[PDB]
Amino acid sequence: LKGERGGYVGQFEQEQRNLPNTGKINSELFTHNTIQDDVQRPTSDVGGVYSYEAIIAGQTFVAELRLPDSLVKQITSKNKNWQAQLKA
RNA sequence: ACUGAAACUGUAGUAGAACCAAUCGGGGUCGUCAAUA
Numbered sequence: 001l002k003g004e005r006g007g008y009v010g011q012f013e014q015e016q017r018n019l020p021n022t023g024k025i026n027s028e029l030f031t032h033n034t035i036q037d038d039v040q041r042p043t044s045d046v047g048g049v050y051s052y053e054a055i056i057a058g059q060t061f062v063a064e065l066r067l068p069d070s071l072v073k074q075i076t077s078k079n080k081n082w083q084a085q086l087k088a
Numbered sequence: 089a090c091u092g093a094a095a096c097u098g099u100a101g102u103a104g105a106a107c108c109a110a111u112c113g114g115g116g117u118c119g120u121c122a123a124u125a
Contacts, residue, residue, distance in 0.1 A: 034095040041099035049097065 026056050 010021035031051045036043040065086075067075075075082045 031097060032095070033097040035098065039099075040096095042097075043099095046095075050095075 025059060027053050028056050029053050 008023040008025075010023065012020040029051050030053075031049060033042045033049045034046040035041060036046045042048045079085065
């Protein structure tokens with residue numbers, strides 16, 4: 001055998017009878033340059049080219065904000081529709 | 089127990105060189121056609 005080393009597994013109940021669904025995150029490499037302004041082309045003095053891997057568009061992620069009841073009281077006493085402010 | 093910032097995938101480079109839209113041809117000239125009685 002070899003160990004599993006990454007990716008994300010979905011939900012799994014004590015009698016799932018199936019392997020859990022596996023989510024994969026699509027990522028792409030983007031490549032950029034810096035232009036040395038007097039020669040108007042990349043040069044070693046400006047570092048030339050650099051790359052970023054990025055999580056591409058269209059991916060959907062779930063976070064959770066956890067708050068104690070005392071803060072949720074505090075918020076709700078000031079805005080009853082406060083979870084609507086979390087749309088951004 | 090707190091998102092790094094900032095950075096043009098740009099710079100130089102003639103889709104071009106060679107290649108016949110061409111070769112041959114008198115604006116010419118004679119007997120055919122029909123089948124019977």
